[PDB]
């Protein structure tokens, strides 16, 4: 469809003209960051860009991509380089390192330099890098994490800790030799590490001694309690922290966010990864974006100021599964937690990042008309006379071949949320992919964000706005009210 | 391969020190810029730079994605939004009059508003759309346009013609009706519409009667003059100008390039398109860098400055074969005509803009390791058992079915430069994709480029920054020396 304004060229200049004056208005802070904030979209790369977009403007009552998502509005933009040192295309761990920590590391280790090498515990020791996050908790800071993974799952285990091997989630997952070495599971890094003033996602069932039934799935006992040490870790951290409020539900989330007694927090809302958004039960279990405000409701509080993290972290997942729908809604949502954080927080104080860890193999092609669905099929067949769909990955589950040959498509077929969306390789699951992902800027220092940069400057600019970390002596006034 | 140096967190702090160093020494110009180059990858979406990138680094004595490329050397990077006006994956044509002309058009016209159509020339009236170089060349600046493609292909076109039909190369291309109607083909507009300085690239054919050879390939009748109206273009255009110089080949180019008489200077330099950087004839054909070069020498002649178009035109051409070798060689020789433009003018008074005007259905992926060819296979066989390669399309024609099943792949073969990597879906051509591009930036009043914006905003802030077009009222001073 031609919407009809834009056949006018008036449209396209007075924009532009609008843009260009937007353009000039801007100007850098000579004042710190109070607050920080870090939006990862793990697997959201330019691709998963701009088919959220498409997706969410379609959502509203729009055509598509001339609607702004919300990261969409950052005035500043720069290319972020996410290999591995060790890897082209990288993983959720190392990259942690390099966005969160400022130090690029090898593939599947979180908090390490690379010295260390994956899943030896015996190169741990000397090689850990300490978190922006961790940096801003010793200046006085509150700090969170929000995340739709496991709070132990790669990306937010980078803000705390320190481990050769993200698979490390409990001590059942850390062979004998590590544990007698004195590596620690991903789990007692959270509670043990560093002082966390919100914690808010998945991943329950690390925390309970086998055995322990799971409080919202009694009665499936794959989801009860993990550990083997017989640890209570929601306890042991409810023990250190006068104030201190466990909760697993939304209901119970809620109060303690508007309780001026609590002062710490710890939301843990699945035995492992949060449901998909589309899944989410919304009586037991919070939004990403929901959790980000109840974050924001208690790290607020502290005059000094907070580092908050919050993760759109399966998008991914929803790659990794070749389902486009489910990687682009929870792309949207993660979208919705960037504006929420916006209406609640001031770019005159507070400077917030959007960045991906790394891509997918996910392209959106065939040439589609304006205004049609992003999980649609291209006009016109393919060389084998059969249909085939815009959203395509290189390689993935959604290779198939029905009686020898690639399978025709239907428009109900490819609009299904279950549906994957066809590949070039077969693999039980699609893989990351190595290109450049985008870093969106806005606050104090955000105009630093620019270019080409490594990976490692997304670290290093937060810690430099907000004057910590090897960076005082930044040169920068008091954060503007 | 894990370079030895990159083990230690010093090396990424310090290199992280300096970017920010860097970060904090840009600062906006109040000057005009005197001179305007674009740079135009055709189909070099983030994924392309990324993978040439790797290439390139590897080219040199490097591991590949740690090595910059002279367009990551610009300071300034937004995402540009690509989709046409009646597609969401657009075409050269109508992505052209966006960056060229600062308006949105539809899937395969060029120089015309949305209010065209395509193919149907009684609706170009009324709907064509300057472009920045005639404005430049309005203000007495010199302008050129270059490209490793026929001179009359979409994207060189958008610099000078207003069609609704991207597919008018010659005379012989436009039906009768048309012809009647008045809508001249791309090669007469380019030496009718407006005065050209330099004209470099492909497209010999399309100048010259039927019946005439070829000067280069007198024996292969294809390759002859393509008109049908007895003109001869080339004779024409000469005829106009006082030190106009017609060349075909390379020596003949030099020898222009050089000469203070020449003022006009068209070099045709194959019948269709140049041949791919990896088939160059180094002693007929020039490359890209050194059409550039000879495009330089002319137009900065002019103490009014100049406007230059600059195309890596089949870098597009080879991800349509599905030869990633060929797109990639593609986008390092446009890199090193970028590169050869920065030594040859001022930062301080050009602004230079590279981007593209869409992307493809490329991605790079698998695992593989640092320092791996990018044409090498992933690690690990996929779930078919058989090898796959770390370059992977969603569509086009490197898609296989040997006896049945899905080929097996070695690394000699992967490596070759006819080699297509395999899609998910059969086509003839592989498509074009839709997300974002990037655009990068140097120069007066690059910080203007920033963010994500529609493609028209290159257009609109190359008029801005040398004060053309509607932007007198510029607010700017004088360029800088
Ligand atoms: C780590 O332990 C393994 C297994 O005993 C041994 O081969 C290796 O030398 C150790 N490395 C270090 C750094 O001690
Ligand atoms: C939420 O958790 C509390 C225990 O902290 C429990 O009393 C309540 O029943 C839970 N809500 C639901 C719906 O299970
Ligand atoms: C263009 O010509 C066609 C063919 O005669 C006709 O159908 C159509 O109405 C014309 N459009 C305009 C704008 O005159
Ligand atoms: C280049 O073109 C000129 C004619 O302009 C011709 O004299 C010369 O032979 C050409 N060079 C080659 C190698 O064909
Ligand atoms: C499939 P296989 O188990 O072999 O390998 C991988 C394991 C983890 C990973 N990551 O992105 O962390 C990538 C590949
Ligand atoms: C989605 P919506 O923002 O409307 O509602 C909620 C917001 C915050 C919250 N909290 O526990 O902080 C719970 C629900
Ligand atoms: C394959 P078919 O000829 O049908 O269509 C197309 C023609 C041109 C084009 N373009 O990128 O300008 C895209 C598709
Ligand atoms: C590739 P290299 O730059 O070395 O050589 C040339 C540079 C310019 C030129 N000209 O005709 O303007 C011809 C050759
Ligand atoms: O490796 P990551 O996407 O969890
Ligand atoms: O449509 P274009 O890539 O020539
Ligand atoms: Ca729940
Ligand atoms: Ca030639
Ligand atoms: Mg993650
Ligand atoms: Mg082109
Ligand atoms: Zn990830
Ligand atoms: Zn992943
Ligand atoms: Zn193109
Ligand atoms: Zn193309």
Not at 196 to 222: A, C, H, N, Q
Not at 284 to 299: F, K, N, V, Y
Not at 300 to 316: H, Y
Request: net charge negative.
């Amino acid at each position: 469809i031609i919407p009809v304004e834009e056949e006018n060229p008036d449209f396209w200049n007075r924009e532009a003209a609008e843009a260009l004056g937007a353009a000039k208005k801007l100007q850098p802070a000579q004042t710190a960051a109070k607050n920080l904030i870090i939006f990862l979209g793990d697997g959201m790369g330019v691709s998963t860009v701009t088919a959220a977009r498409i997706l969410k403007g379609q959502k509203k009552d729009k055509l598509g991509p001339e609607i702004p998502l919300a990261m969409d509005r950052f005035p500043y933009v720069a290319l972020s380089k996410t290999y591995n040192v060790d890897k082209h295309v990288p993983d959720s761990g190392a990259t942690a390192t390099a966005y969160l920590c400022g130090v690029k590391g090898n593939f599947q280790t979180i908090g390490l330099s690379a010295a260390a090498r994956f899943n030896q515990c015996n190169t741990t020791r000397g090689n850990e890098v300490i978190s922006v996050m961790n940096r801003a908790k010793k200046a006085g800071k509150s700090v969170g994490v929000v995340t739709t993974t496991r709070v132990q799952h790669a990306s937010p285990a980078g803000t705390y800790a320190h481990t050769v091997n993200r698979n490390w989630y409990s001590d059942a997952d850390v062979p004998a030799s590590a544990r007698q070495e004195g590596c620690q599971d991903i789990a007692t890094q959270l509670i043990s590490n560093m002082d966390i003033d919100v914690i808010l996602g998945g991943g329950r069932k690390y925390m309970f001694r086998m055995g322990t039934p799971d409080p919202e799935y009694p009665d499936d006992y794959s989801q009860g309690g993990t550990r083997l040490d017989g640890k209570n870790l929601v306890q042991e951290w409810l023990a250190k922290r006068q104030g201190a409020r466990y909760v697993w539900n939304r209901t119970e989330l809620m109060q303690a966010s508007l309780d001026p007694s609590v002062t710490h927090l710890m939301g843990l809302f699945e035995p492992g990864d949060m449901k998909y958004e589309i899944h989410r039960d919304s009586t037991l279990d919070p939004s990403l974006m929901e959790m980000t405000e109840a974050a924001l409701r208690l790290l607020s509080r502290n005059p000094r100021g907070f580092f908050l993290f919050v993760e759109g972290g399966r998008i991914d997942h929803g790659h990794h599964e070749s389902r486009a729908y489910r990687a682009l809604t929870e792309t949207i949502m993660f979208d919705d937690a960037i504006e929420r954080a916006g209406q609640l927080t001031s770019e005159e104080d507070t400077l917030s990042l959007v960045t991906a860890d790394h891509s997918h193999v996910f392209s959106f092609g065939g040439y589609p008309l304006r205004g049609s669905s992003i999980f649609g099929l291209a006009p016109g067949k393919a060389r084998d006379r059969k249909a085939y769909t815009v959203l395509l990955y290189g390689n993935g589950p959604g290779y198939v071949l029905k009686d020898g040959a690639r399978p025709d498509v239907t428009e109900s077929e490819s609009g299904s949320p279950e549906y994957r969306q066809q590949s070039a390789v077969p693999l039980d699951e699609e893989t990351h992919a190595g290109e450049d992902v985008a870093v969106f800027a806005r606050g104090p220092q955000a105009h630093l964000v620019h270019g080409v940069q490594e990976q490692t400057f997304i670290a290093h600019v937060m810690a430099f706005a907000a004057c910590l970390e090897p960076y005082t002596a930044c040169d920068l006034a008091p954060p503007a009210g």
